[model samples]
Target: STGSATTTPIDSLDDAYITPVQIGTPAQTLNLDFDTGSSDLWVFSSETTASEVDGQTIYTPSKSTTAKLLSGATWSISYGDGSSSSGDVYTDTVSVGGLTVTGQAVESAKKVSSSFTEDSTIDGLLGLAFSTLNTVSPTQQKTFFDNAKASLDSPVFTADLGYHAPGTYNFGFIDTTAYTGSITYTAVSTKQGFWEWTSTGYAVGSGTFKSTSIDGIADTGTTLLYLPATVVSAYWAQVSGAKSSSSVGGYVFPCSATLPSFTFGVGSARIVIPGDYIDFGPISTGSSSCFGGIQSSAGIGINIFGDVALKAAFVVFNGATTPTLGFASK
Candidate 1:
């Protein structure tokens, strides 16, 4: 069986994409972030504290007759930014688009950080990365993709994240009409549980291409693109009056600055991010300083091709025993 779902950006900056998912016996629908950066299908639930409950839709396991507690099972996850959430485990019927998976692990949150509580657009996250990264104790659970693969026409999924418009996440089959040109396939290493690969090179605007190996992960859950410090500094230097600011906590420039495009190579395929897209937005409400869509990953310990980069092309996350990533222009 194949499934298709439309995902929309929750905010103006295209910070994250939220897709509607149905859970339980009667079907409780909630907007969830389909994150490929981490593994753990967690949600805001009836067990969450009242203080942490804001505008998010909560999952009530009691309402789902099919729900079953995984005795003594619990999970905790923390992100690079320090945001975190922890909860108990439950097995229930879950569906996305038109595909249904019975007995899928559904983590019901008991605690959540302020950042997640403040973000009202997303109720929870559905991880798409390898199951090895799952945080559940005693026994790690398979992600929705992993569980649904057996019934799918093909054990693969694709992401088509858009700039501001609604995009699509397709499972089991690749929609031929969704992309243009031919796909350039590359081997993927899941040793770290990420869809990790090495990019061939990079170029700033129409400048000369720099041939170098840049290893990174294709993370749909992340907001911005992060590369080496030298690469980030080189791109920022081309913008007039651009500088790293402590106040902004990143590289910022004049709001009206003429920014240059960024290009990265996947094998020999080139994906270009428009100059305007790089100007993420104002540092604050009506502020003249603008933040960049690409930043330095030096401190993060790894480079990440986040939404800023992934949205520039059609990406395939193949889930074969020998996994491979396919990229194509759209």
Candidate 2:
């Protein structure tokens, strides 16, 4: 059973890159954040309280003839930013980029926090992480990727994200045209249900590189890069007016401050994130201060090479007996 598909990112720039998916029988389309960090295909649906869901689209499972209610089965999820959603479960057809999974567990949110409602564009989250990470209570659910991999030419997916423009998420096969040069791959550990890997070290601009082993995840759902405190300190130190402001939650600097490119190692290959990309725009609306995209992971323990880092490279998430990550310039 050979199958493959490609998805293009929505217009969000450095924000969560979203792709369209069709769920249920009638095939209602919704824009979902394809998250590699979490595994739960939960969506804002008819089950969600009317007031709880803001200006987002909702999927009404009752209208789908193929929908099946999972009695006594429920789902609740929370994120690092305090965003949370909860509700009952239903099994239905879920399709991503035209690849369909029959009877996929589609968690219908009945209760959603303001955090989610505030960020109203996303209709749901399609988790692409390992199936084991799926949170479906007593019986853990498998991700759509897990269910669809059996039909793919290979059990792998490629994430190609661009700055301020659309990118493609390719499944089953690698499109060499999407990237330049050779792809450098490194071993990945999935013990944490993440595309966790290590780096040789990092450098600010053309400065000396540190061989510090930074263990982190390649998370598409996250907006910024989170690294060790020392690493964050070292990076911001290069900026003239940079300071770690607790009020803003992370590091910040003057809007016009000159920043240096951040480079990191992947095996023998090295990649650089442009200096302008590090300045993640202004902290708030009409502000002279800007938030640094690179922040401290701190309590999280693991560094997160999120959108800010991934957008700089064409990434291949290899799903095998032992997962491996492939990276190359786009």
Candidate 3:
């Protein structure tokens, strides 16, 4: 169940990052980004203006063994964070980890803004996380995974994110050992890719939080965990010597001693977030202070369990078999 994949910076790679792929009878190489939030394959094209496509690596199809532009079909994607990009459709051969896959559908962006263009190191993102967030479809869009899944060694794909690395994303094969023995799967909703749920309740140390009754969702795209302001404040109040410092985003706290452990009730299963994760990052405001994990996002509306909360466990999305999400120990 364990498998390994290689990851490198988007650009300035000392070694060849291009993966050779078979296109029809010929072969070609394509650049990819291993992104966990969304499932799609896209590349910057030479047709993009220098100013618009700045800081991005534009792939010249003529240089490849074979590449074809899909005329009449274009696409524009707007992220929840307000970031957006537009491009055209194209078909080519792509490779990863020496595994050559043919007839891959790729999005060739024709127009990109400074935000995307400024990121020269990561030209494209290869989303291997889950299919619920996949942007491609048979009638509307064609994704690289949708085209390559039939030929893959296994029908499933997994992602392993490198620690502290910005673009260190790996793909292919699930590592069962990476997760705890038990797997609790949840059904998926069609509204959005987000995994929705309702909190039965929460416990901090020996205390429990009120108004535990609220609908919520688990999203990997969000970086910070967001919760009801009142619930967050009330929970933090239970921690001894827990004091909010102005420097650490005003939401976080600082404490010298080890903090108490907390558990969140997700339906019947209790998910425990250790004390170390509570003070994972350094405090910016206070001297010798560490930022607390649970922060006040009461005014922010919906609660989100982001990367910090997710790093403690392994998350799996079984889109290939069913519209369900699963979680286990990492």
For 1-330, candidate 3 gives per-residue lDDT tens digits of 212345443332111122222222244334454444555666677766667765556666666656776666666666544666667766676666545555566667677666667766546655444455655433354355555555655554443332333322223455666666675665555355445556666777766544366455555444545667666676678666666666546455455666766666655565666666566454543456556667665555567665545544565544455545555654
* Cα deviation of 132, candidate 1, in Å: 0.8
Among residues 3 or more apart in sequence or in different chains, the pairs in candidate 2 whose N, CA or C atoms overlap within 3 Å are none
lDDT of 2: 0.86
lDDT of 2 by residue, 79-98 (tens): 77778898989999988776
Per-candidate TM-scores read 0.99, 0.96, 0.68
Q: How does candidate 1 score on lDDT? A: 0.93
All candidates: CA RMSD (Å): 0.8, 1.6, 6.0
Ordered list by lDDT, greatest first: 1, 2, 3
The most accurate candidate by lDDT is: 1
**Clashes within 3 Å, all models in order:** 0, 0, 4
Which window of 10 residues has the lowest lDDT sum in candidate 3?
Answer: 12-21
Q: Per-residue lDDT of 104-168 in model 1, one digit per residue for the tens?
A: 99999999999999999999999998999999998899999999998999999999999888999
Off by over 4 Å in 3: 1-39, 52-55, 97-101, 127-139, 152-154, 162-173, 194-201, 204-218, 234-267, 274-303
Clashes of 3: 4
The regions of model 2 sitting more than 4 angstroms off are 1-13
